[PDB]
Amino acid sequence: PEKKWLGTPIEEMRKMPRCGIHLPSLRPSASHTVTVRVDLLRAGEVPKPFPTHYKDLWDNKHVKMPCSEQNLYPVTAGSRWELIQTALLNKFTRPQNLKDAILKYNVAYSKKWDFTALVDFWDKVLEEAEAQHLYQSILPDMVKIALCLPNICTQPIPLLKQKMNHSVTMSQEQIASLLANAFFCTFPRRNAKMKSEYSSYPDINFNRLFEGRSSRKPEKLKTLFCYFRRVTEKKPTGLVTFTRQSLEDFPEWERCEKPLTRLHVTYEGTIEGNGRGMLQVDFANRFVGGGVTGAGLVQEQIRFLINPELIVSRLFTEVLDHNECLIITGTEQYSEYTGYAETYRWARSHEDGSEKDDWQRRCTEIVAIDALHFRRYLDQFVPEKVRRELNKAYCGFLRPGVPSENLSAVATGNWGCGAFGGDARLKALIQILAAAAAERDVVYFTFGDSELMRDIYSMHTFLTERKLDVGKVYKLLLRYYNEECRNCSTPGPDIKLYPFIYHAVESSA
Numbered sequence: 001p002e003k004k005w006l007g008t009p010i011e012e013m014r015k016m017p018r019c020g021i022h023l024p025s026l027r028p029s030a031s032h033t034v035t036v037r038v039d040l041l042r043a044g045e046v047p048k049p050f051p052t053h054y055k056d057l058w059d060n061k062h063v064k065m066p067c068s069e070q071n072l073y074p075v076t077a078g079s080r081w082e083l084i085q086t087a088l089l090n091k092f093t094r095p096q097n098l099k100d101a102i103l104k105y106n107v108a109y110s111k112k113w114d115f116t117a118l119v120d121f122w123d124k125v126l127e128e129a130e131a132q133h134l135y136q137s138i139l140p141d142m143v144k145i146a147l148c149l150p151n152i153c154t155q156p157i158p159l160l161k162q163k164m165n166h167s168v169t170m171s172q173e174q175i176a177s178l179l180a181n182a183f184f185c186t187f188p189r190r191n192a193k194m195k196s197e198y199s200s201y202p203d204i205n206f207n208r209l210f211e212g213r214s215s216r217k218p219e220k221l222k223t224l225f226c227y228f229r230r231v232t233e234k235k236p237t238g239l240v241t242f243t244r245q246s247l248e249d250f251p252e253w254e255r256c257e258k259p260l261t262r263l264h265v266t267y268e269g270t271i272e273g274n275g276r277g278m279l280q281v282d283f284a285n286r287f288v289g290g291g292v293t294g295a296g297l298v299q300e301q302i303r304f305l306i307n308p309e310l311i312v313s314r315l316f317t318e319v320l321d322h323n324e325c326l327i328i329t330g331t332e333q334y335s336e337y338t339g340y341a342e343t344y345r346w347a348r349s350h351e352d353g354s355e356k357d358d359w360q361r362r363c364t365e366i367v368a369i370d371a372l373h374f375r376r377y378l379d380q381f382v383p384e385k386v387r388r389e390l391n392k393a394y395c396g397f398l399r400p401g402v403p404s405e406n407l408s409a410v411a412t413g414n415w416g417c418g419a420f421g422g423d424a425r426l427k428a429l430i431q432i433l434a435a436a437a438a439e440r441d442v443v444y445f446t447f448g449d450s451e452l453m454r455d456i457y458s459m460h461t462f463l464t465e466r467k468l469d470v471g472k473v474y475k476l477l478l479r480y481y482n483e484e485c486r487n488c489s490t491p492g493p494d495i496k497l498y499p500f501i502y503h504a505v506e507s508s509a
């Protein structure tokens with residue numbers, strides 16, 4: 001019978017906090033927005049905002065806050081925030097009470113936003129006692145933190161636009177307020193389908209969480225209400241950093257002399273569970289988070305639901321271009337789940353026991369890197385497409401300025417494979433080569449595919465023992481393309497990639 005894991009023992013891999021650099025004092029800079037009082041930051045205490053009082057910016061460089069005086073609405077043009085306050089400061093006892101509240105300042109979507117999933121969750125899924133707790137405690141507590149936004153999020157939040165290399169660090173507390181606003185659908189200019197300014201950003205308002213008849217919706221609702229109950233009952237004290245990274249220059253893949261690094265590969269375990277303290281890959285949509293409140297419930301959405309603080313990146317993160325990624329450090333896990341996609345179920349609250357770094361960020365680092373979709377299988381072997389995926393992965397893994405010995409292993413798996421069209425064996429090798437270029441080790445989860453585990457180890461062991469560096473491996477991929485793919489008249493070649501690599505090397509001088 002197969003072994004459960006192969007390669008370097010997972011305990012020998014680097015992880016946070018042990019491997020981390022000594023952090024300089026947290027401070028704002030031209031590259032780093034920081035929305036809390038760094039001099040007052042103390043372990044276990046709720047961070048205080050900077051500035052002390054609300055400052056507004058309503059422009060094309062910053063989040064358009066619902067509490068802005070420039071957020072206007074017909075009442076003559078009146079304050080939309082005053083309308084939001086009035087709508088939400090009402091008793092809810094029936095689901096239509098919450099619908100009608102949200103629609104008071106979203107009149108234009110009265111027909112377009114269905115609330116069937118909210119109604120059925122409230123009336124059918126929840127027992128009487130749980131519904132009562134929802135409407136007597138949770139929802140009013142959520143309203144309270146939502147309407148505290150201007151006192152909590154005092155500093156304008158910059159948009160992380162394409163090409164920016166920039167970080168925003170905010171408190172978990174600040175994020176809870178923003179997410180409660182998202183729940184009540186309060187963010188202006190983020191709703192219309194013919195929207196202009198924000199067409200290149202993901203959705204942020206949670207309206208689609210309430211729509212349709214999917215058996216998925218109640219599970220998303222339980223998962224998010226789990227979060228909201230936690231943060232309203234006990235205010236979180238940590239910080240979270242969101243970093244957009246965009247590289248213009250990449251390895252010379254055909255000539256790269258860096259050796260392959262260590263591999264641990266296994267068909268059991270999870271990225272979020274067994275890759276604790278490691279760089280955890282989110283198989284992202286380029287609109288980070290993808291359909292987190294929509295239909296989608298695969299690897300990304302699941303992660304955005306169990307660590308809901310990730311969802312706030314949608315407020316300010318422009319769609320990723322080919323050479324970009326989003327790095328999020330410090331999100332907390334609030335829920336546990338069982339299953340996946342159509343079998344996903346909220347299981348219970350999670351009490352996150354992760355250590356915090358010196359900026360009071362949980363030692364949990366997640367990187368969103370979007371694979372390409374391959375609607376024609378052979379497209380992915382074309383060198384341009386190999387390079388694209390190498391470069392995307394490389395960008396997700398590289399930490400400029402940071403010594404390699406201070407980098408954790410990368411915890412990843414079958415990125416963009418399955419119904420997205422990626423080839424698992426090609427994608428494994430791509431991420432192994434990108435990790436090698438970034439001088440990181442790899443922890444690879446094959447999620448039940450033991451033969452794939454075996455094949456990836458065998459290949460990695462062969463290339464390692466035969467001392468082929470990144471460039472030599474890359475050159476073999478170009479050989480496979482040129483000799484077996486370029487003129488292939490079938491959907492896939494007769495000779496597969498790993499068999500080709502073995503034969504090529506075994507045939508060589």
Ligand SMILES: Nc1ncnc2c1ncn2[C@@H]1O[C@H](COP(=O)(O)O)[C@@H](O)[C@H]1O[C@H]1O[C@H](COP(=O)(O)O)[C@@H](O)[C@H]1O
Nearest residue numbers: 026027028033034035036037038039040049050051052053
């Ligand atoms: N994220 C931040 N951005 C900008 N300044 C900050 C931040 N965090 C702390 N400071 C400031 O850096 C200083 C610490 O610098 P040292 O550690 O080197 O000494 C802090 O005192 C903070 O000062 C400002 O906040 C205060 C607001 O006061 P009221 O508006 O309520 O009157 C005011 O003093 C103002 O100057």
